[PDB]
Amino acid sequence: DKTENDIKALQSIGQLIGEVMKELSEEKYIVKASSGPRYIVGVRNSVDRSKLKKGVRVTLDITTLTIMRILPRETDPLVYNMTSFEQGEITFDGIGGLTEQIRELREVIELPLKNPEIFQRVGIKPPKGVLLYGPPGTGKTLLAKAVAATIGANFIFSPASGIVDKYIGESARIIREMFAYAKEHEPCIIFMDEVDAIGGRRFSEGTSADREIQRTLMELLTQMDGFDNLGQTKIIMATNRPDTLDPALLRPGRLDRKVEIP
Amino acid sequence: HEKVTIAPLVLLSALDHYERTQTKENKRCVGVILGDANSSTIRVTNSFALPFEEDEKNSDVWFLDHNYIENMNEMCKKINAKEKLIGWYHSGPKLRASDLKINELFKKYTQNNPLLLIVDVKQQGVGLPTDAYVAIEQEKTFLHLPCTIEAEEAEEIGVEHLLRIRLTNQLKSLKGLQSKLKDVVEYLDKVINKELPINHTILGKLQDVFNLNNLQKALTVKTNDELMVIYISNLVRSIIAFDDLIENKIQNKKIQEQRVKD
Amino acid sequence: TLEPSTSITLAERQQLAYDLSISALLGDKIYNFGELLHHPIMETIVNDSNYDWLFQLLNALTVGDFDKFDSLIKVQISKIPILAQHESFLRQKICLMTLIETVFVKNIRMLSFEDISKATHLPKDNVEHLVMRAISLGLLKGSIDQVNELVTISWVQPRIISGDQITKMKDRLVEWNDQVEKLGKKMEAR
Amino acid sequence: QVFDERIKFANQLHDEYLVSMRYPEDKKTQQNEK
Amino acid sequence: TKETVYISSIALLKMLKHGRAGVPMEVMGLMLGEFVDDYTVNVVDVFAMPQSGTGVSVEAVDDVFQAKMMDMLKQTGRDQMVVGWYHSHPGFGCWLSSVDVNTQKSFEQLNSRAVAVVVDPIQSVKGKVVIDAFRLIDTGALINNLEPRQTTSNTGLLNKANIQALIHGLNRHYYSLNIDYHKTAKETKMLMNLHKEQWQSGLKMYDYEEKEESNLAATKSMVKIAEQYSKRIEEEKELTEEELKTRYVGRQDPKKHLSETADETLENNIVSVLTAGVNSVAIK
Amino acid sequence: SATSGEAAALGMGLCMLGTGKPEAIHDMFTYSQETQHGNITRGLAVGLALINYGRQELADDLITKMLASDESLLRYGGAFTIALAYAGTGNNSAVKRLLHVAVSDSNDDVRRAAVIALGFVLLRDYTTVPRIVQLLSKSHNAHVRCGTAFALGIACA
Amino acid sequence: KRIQSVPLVIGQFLEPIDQNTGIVSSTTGMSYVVRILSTLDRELLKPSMSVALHRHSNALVDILPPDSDSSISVMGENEKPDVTYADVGGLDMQKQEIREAVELPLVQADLYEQIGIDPPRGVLLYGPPGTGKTMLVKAVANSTKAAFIRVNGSEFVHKYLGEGPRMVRDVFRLARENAPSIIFIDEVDSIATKRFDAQTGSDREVQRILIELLTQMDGFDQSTNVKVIMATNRADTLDPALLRPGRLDRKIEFPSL
Amino acid sequence: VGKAAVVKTSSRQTVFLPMVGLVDPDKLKPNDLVGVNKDSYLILDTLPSEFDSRVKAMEVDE
Amino acid sequence: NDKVRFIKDELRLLQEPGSYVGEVIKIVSDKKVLVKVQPEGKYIVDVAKDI
Amino acid sequence: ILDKIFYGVLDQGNGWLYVYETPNQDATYDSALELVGQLNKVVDQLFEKAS
């Protein structure tokens, strides 16, 4: 049966995956293909038209261009960026000696992710971003693994130079991902590792193709000021020195927490 | 209960091999079907005949070779692997001990209940030349599932190219009115008068239609309120009939213009 | 209905029918006591020694006299009021099903508290509260009218009896016979 | 009762326009034109 | 003359069903029948063939699978000599077969009547089914045989023939594509009782009621919604022509609202009879 | 025979011109339903038309069988069967039957064969021939326009 | 008419050529020259109107209704009744110029016709980074209960080049079609530049976004219903062509200090 | 729900496919390059012991 | 008859694959013209016999 | 009641009350504009065409 199921698995065909853009009619929908073209697709009796509306990722057909099945919504399923590969090594007792600054982080991180009603009773909004800086060699890299060894929630590691891969519209889309997955995967914590790049003013010498990085900074600034519900998701951004970061971010309204590790 | 959906390709393909074998009325052809019986709607995407031999003077005589069935299943795995044996069909109007006893023979190679089919070669009466029958172990009785005819987009139009308003649509209404008359009178007169069969099990379902001029005279007072929508339809239609005079008056300018040019 | 299964002697058939009798006394579900008549139950027993309770309740529904059946039974089943309550329900269920097709040929749906009063041998005050009890048990769907003294109830549950509705099912199709001419000829002429 | 006459009255004006065109066209189409 | 294959109703759908899986995915099959050269060609039964590592090719034919299928069809009376092979090629769409070129030359050694039926645009069916066969002309230089006799030849007007890239020469020495269908007495009554335009058979009064019942809230809406759009078009283009002289300079405007509202006035009369007719006709 | 099989029906049809042999009508018609050919069945339709020449209403029995049959080749010869039997003196019912075939039937070869048969019935009056074929020449069918093209030049030659 | 049916390809009209013949732009990125279906007309469409195309031949079939992608399609009200203008005070200096270049034309558009003064089409927000806001701009749409469209500067560029200019024409079009709306663009400085455009060049063109912003701005803003609001930062570099009175007028700087 | 793998082609096209018996869910890794079909795009070949590639300049010298 | 024939004649025009768009660059005496297609590259094609 | 706040009608003679639904009309805009809009343009199609 295992060998016969191999032929049965090869009899199946491919299925196109796309997201619904606009609803043309009851049986007529407009779904954008993953390659970027759009088509008017039909419906079947095996799917529910209530979940076929806009903002929901569906499955199309590669032959007749029709809706076949329904899949859960995943923007760009890159797991290595979503999973942080947690292996417990260093805990809060291994980062000790920083306790003056350790008890400072747990109040704006562990407390709002546990009992959020404390900040709601006073009326203050929970802090979004937290800045961890200091001299090199103080364990700022270990701060990501120490906090992650306790809460045990999801953690998204997003290196600076790993997301700068040159593509059309992809550089600004990667930031949109982490805030889009934060609703379905729970707010948890999003981590940024040693970003010296996007925080620059970037006077124009020709920029040498780096204009794709400029829209990356614009997406990060508009996200904090966006109308979407935020404040539950924590943004941990670490860097060697703060001045290289965007002064628009350092000012209040986006990054409310500057935590020094001297 | 369940449902049955058979494409028109399966129905006519079963009739072809009947004449190709020069099968007279004394003999009948038996074959197998393929599809997906797992869901509530049984779909038949394929059919194959079998060398069935039967004596006309004895209903206990039949010839069924499973080696041809075992080979047929192996030949289909190289064509369509998604298809499995969902049952078997047969020809001829009559049901005798030949087709009744073999229903358990196909059960060995069929996971679901084999779906019995009577293929009418002469197509006598109404629609549906083939009827889908299912058997129960609890007493055995042949029940007909809501068999329907449906195919894909290219399969439905494909037979339309090979074959190639309001008054015509009303012609089929009278044919359905006589169907109500001729089915009840012929059946009810058989149960009553001479030769009473064992009944009152079916009578409960028959009179279940008559309770709800077959329906209700208690709403006659309320019917006039339901007829109001029909009277409303004539309110606009009186102007719609006058809307034809709009173009009729505009077209008067054309001929009047022709007299000027002449 | 199964002849081969459950093969028992003649003496055990009367004991099995006794359990079938006492089971239907305390509930109205699954038709009535007349259901076992067509089944090989009442025909396989004897009409004496208090085995006729199923036959006595057949005509007792139309006559509507509880004292006839109460005198032929013992103190065991007569000390529970449920026997008298559900027995009167089956008497009304026959009349409640007369609103659609039983007697009236015109299929006019109407019922009055005076007609059910003579059938159930109860005054006008008791029949008003008695109809609600039959509807609340899931027998039939409908309402009543106290102002005009009218009862409006549809027909759902089938019965085992035949011969009352056989003539009407053909008579209702006679009205369809006169409708084949006028609309059949005028439609083909278009 | 009134709407049944309006349909007949509308089609009556239709029947009047139904057949009148060719009358001036008999002379011009049969004769030679430039 | 040439070889024009007359395909039955069942044999035509089965070849489209075998190549139904995937646009790029390619399959193959085998044709059977008994006919004569010169003109009329028939196809009794067809069945798909397995796909080898080369996809569609001459070595993809399995004699073991072919011999077993002929034995299964021999008991059903469909056993016939091998008249050719049919193939469904991927979604390239330039010219027909994307692989097989000289394989038909090797097919001529086994049978001289062998043809290759290929549907180029995968599955496209709207008003017609486009299928394409092949006939090897061998040497088409001088004095071989006359193709333009049988039926519908000398095509290729200007540069437009079929996909329009073939023009005159087509594949090899103008194989002169011709295909026609046929129907028997049993296939004629089958299609009339099953599929003509839509399938209304098997049940009568439900198609009338269910169309109205699902449209109950819609019909009252559609009569009202289309009521606005009917006059809104009449209140725009019709205002151009008013007096005997020219005012708004109407050109095609008086003809726009006439053709668009011609069916609207017709649909209102159709739904008026349907809504009144279903509730009419007895039913107390 | 796929080659000389057509000359058999054409050769026998020329001998049966006029009243002909009534037995040869049903014999040649039976062989058309038995053998399905490309030239034989169409050739037999021409032979059955030649034997019906001059019979007028006497050929209405065979014409009914050709009009009721769904075969494309049998309907092709059914139009000229009316043309030959009704040739010479015309008939108002003969034109009515030919005009009904060129409309309801969707076969382009039969529509072309039906409009050509109109000229042979209308040979007597050639004044009404150009008026009828001009109305049919305004349709969207090319075979009807091509059929009425030569059908006009028959009686007007 | 029923041949094409559902399997239609999204496209957009470009320029007319011949009677019942026009060139369009398919979402696949290949512009073909095809004809127009006989039931339609060139006068029934618009240069920015979207049409349906065939799968293979890509022939024009049906005119699409006034709807498109426009990144995430917003009807103008999503959870809008939340914050009002009273939540952020001290803006009376800035709000005075905003209400006269937004609130007044959104309510009564006939007041500007009676004064014969051209109302400002666009609105800009100056000031150094960190201006906050994202309150009063939403509060105007909350108090007036009008339509609101928010498209960030990084959302104008689709993953494909040719789709970029097709989506920009749809942003300004969807606002005028249904109800008076307000177009908000956050950080548009990534497009509008001063003579450094495309950072001294990038990719292939990248200038297709700026071309449509300048062209489509003059085509719309007529009935004095939809207004354009763009908040930026200070690069000390701005496009003077956008600031011309024939395109954008209202210029508002944040009351710093 | 069922086990199913989603593949992203090198042409930037997302294709959905059911679980193939030739591979196992434990062997299949996310964001991994595996041999796929040209037509059906089904997963057939496994990972050839290399994550992505050596790009341009790499020294395998021992 | 003219409306059905017109719709039928316009049906084969929509079924035609259509045509690309381009601009003439240079011409020679060989009847070969260089047409620059915007999405595609530059292609040297032969002129029609009517022009 | 006259201010379209509470919809109902009373009885002055017997001191009773009656039931009055909130809508006084059901989809009047349908035939309202269909009528007067037709009466305006039914004459507008003639003018001097009769002279």
Give G210-228 as a DSSP string. HHHHHHHHHHS--SS--EE
In a domain, E176, yes or no: yes
In a domain, E196, yes or no: no
- Separation of first and last alpha carbons in chain A: 64
Cβ atoms of A230 and A123 closer than 8 Å: no
Same domain for E215 and E175:
no
Of E22, E122, E123, Cβ closest to residue A14: E22
Q: Establish whether A53 is an annotated binding residue.
A: no
Cβ atoms of A17 and H15 closer than 8 Å: yes
Q: Where are the beta strands (DSSP E) in chain G?
A: 9-18, 21-26, 33-35, 50-53, 60-63, 122-125, 147-150, 181-186, 227-231, 250-252
**Residues of the domain holding E170:** 2-181
Q: For chain B, say whether J28 makes contact (Cβ under 8 Å).
A: no
- Burial (CB count <10 Å: 0-12, 13-18, 19+), residue E7: buried
CB contact under 8 A, J49 and B250: no
> In sequence order, which residues have a C-beta less than 8 Å from that of residue H4 and are 6 or more positions away?
H16, H17, H18, H19
The answer for I 1-51 residues in CB contact with E (under 8 A) is 16-17
In a domain, E177, yes or no: yes
Same domain for E234 and E142:
no
Cβ atoms of G20 and I6 closer than 8 Å: no
- Category of A230 on φ-ψ map: left (φ > 0), alpha (ψ -120 to 50) or beta: beta
Of D22, E222, D18, the residue nearest B262 (C-alpha)? D22
Q: Where are the beta strands (DSSP E) in chain B?
A: 3-6, 30-36, 41-50, 53-54, 62-63, 84-91, 116-119, 130-135, 142-144, 147-148
* CA–CA separation, A22 and F79 (whole Å): 57
Query: Residue E163: what are its φ and ψ, rounded to 5°?
Result: -65, -15
Q: For chain E, say whether B189 makes contact (Cβ under 8 Å).
A: no
Look-up of token digits 């009559």: B94
> In sequence order, which residues have a C-beta less than 8 Å from that of residue A60 and are 6 or more positions away?
A15, A16, A17, A18, A31, A33, A39, A41, A66, A67, A68
Same domain for E43 and E158:
yes
User: What is the residue type of G129?
Assistant: P
Task: Mutation target for A interface from H6, H10, H11, H14: give the one with most A CBs within 10 A.
Answer: H14
* CA–CA separation, B44 and B11 (whole Å): 10
- CATH number at B86 reads 3.40.140.10
Structural domains in chain E (count): 2
Of E39, E183, E188, Cβ closest to residue F2: E39
Of F94, F102, F92, the residue nearest F52 (C-alpha)? F94
Discontinuities in chain D with C to N beyond 2.5 Å fall right after none
In order of A75, A161, C187, the CA distances from C190 in angstroms are 61, 81, 6
Q: What count of other Cβ atoms lies within 10 Å of the Cβ of residue E148?
A: 13
Quote the tokens at residue I43: 């292609």
Q: What count of other Cβ atoms lies within 10 Å of the Cβ of residue A161?
A: 11
In order of B148, E2, E53, E98, E105, the CA distances from E102 in angstroms are 46, 19, 19, 12, 5
> In sequence order, which residues have a C-beta less than 8 Å from that of residue B76 and are 6 or more positions away?
B34, B46, B83
- DSSP H stretches of helix in H3-62: none
Same domain for E216 and E129:
no
- Category of G195 on φ-ψ map: left (φ > 0), alpha (ψ -120 to 50) or beta: left
User: What is the residue type of E271?
Assistant: V
Q: For chain G, say whether I14 makes contact (Cβ under 8 Å).
A: yes
Of G33, G57, G162, Cβ closest to residue I15: G57
Residue A126 carries which DSSP code? P
CB contact under 8 A, I17 and G35: no
**DSSP bridge pairs for I27:** I33
Task: Enter the resolution in angstroms.
Answer: 4.5
Task: Mutation target for B interface from D1, D7, D12, D30: give the one with most B CBs within 10 A.
Answer: D7
CB contact under 8 A, G41 and E252: yes
Chains with 3 or more CB pairs closer than 8 angstroms to A? B, E, G, H
Same domain for E81 and E117:
yes
In a domain, E201, yes or no: no
* CA–CA separation, F70 and F72 (whole Å): 6
Q: Are strands A38-41 and E4-7 parallel, antiparallel or unpaired?
A: unpaired
State the helix-helix crossing angle for B153-163 and E9-18, rounded to 10 degrees. 160
Quote the tokens at residue F151: 């059908």
Same domain for E20 and E70:
yes
Q: For chain I, say whether E68 makes contact (Cβ under 8 Å).
A: no
In a domain, E195, yes or no: no
Q: Which helix (H) or strand (E) holds A203?
A: none
> Quick check: helix, strand or coil at residue D17?
helix
- SS3 percent helix, strand, coil of chain J, rounded to 5, is 35, 10, 55
Last residue of a domain, one of E124, E147, E181: E181
In a domain, E198, yes or no: no
In order of A18, A19, A94, E19, E124, the CA distances from A67 in angstroms are 10, 11, 54, 20, 18
State the helix-helix crossing angle for E262-279 and B166-191, rounded to 10 degrees. 20
* CA–CA separation, B73 and B81 (whole Å): 10
Q: For chain B, say whether E109 makes contact (Cβ under 8 Å).
A: no
- Does I have 3 or more CB contacts under 8 Å with B? no
* CA–CA separation, F66 and F33 (whole Å): 11
**Residues of the domain holding B127:** 1-164
- DSSP H stretches of helix in C64-178: 66-71, 75-78, 81-96, 113-120, 124-136, 166-177
CA angle A74, A80, A85 (to 5 degrees): 120
Same domain for E227 and E109:
no
- Category of C112 on φ-ψ map: left (φ > 0), alpha (ψ -120 to 50) or beta: beta
> Quick check: helix, strand or coil at residue G34?
strand
Cβ atoms of G28 and G66 closer than 8 Å: no
In order of B232, B240, E264, the CA distances from J27 in angstroms are 12, 18, 20
Rg (CA), chain E: 28
Q: Say how far residue C39 (Cα) sits from the centre of its chain.
A: 17
Discontinuities in chain B with C to N beyond 2.5 Å fall right after 138, 164, 212
Cβ atoms of A112 and A235 closer than 8 Å: no
> In sequence order, which residues have a C-beta less than 8 Å from that of residue G94 and are 6 or more positions away?
G136, G252, G254, G255
Q: What count of other Cβ atoms lies within 10 Å of the Cβ of residue C168?
A: 18
Question: J-chain residues within 8 Å CB-CB of B252?
Answer: 49
* CA–CA separation, F35 and F41 (whole Å): 8
Cβ atoms of F112 and F143 closer than 8 Å: yes
Q: Find the length of chain F.
A: 157
In a domain, E194, yes or no: no
Q: For chain E, say whether G3 makes contact (Cβ under 8 Å).
A: yes
* CA–CA separation, C118 and C134 (whole Å): 18
Q: For chain E, say whether A49 makes contact (Cβ under 8 Å).
A: no
Q: What count of other Cβ atoms lies within 10 Å of the Cβ of residue F13?
A: 24
The technique by which this structure was obtained is cryo-EM
In a domain, E189, yes or no: no
* CA–CA separation, E116 and G241 (whole Å): 65
> Quick check: helix, strand or coil at residue A194?
coil
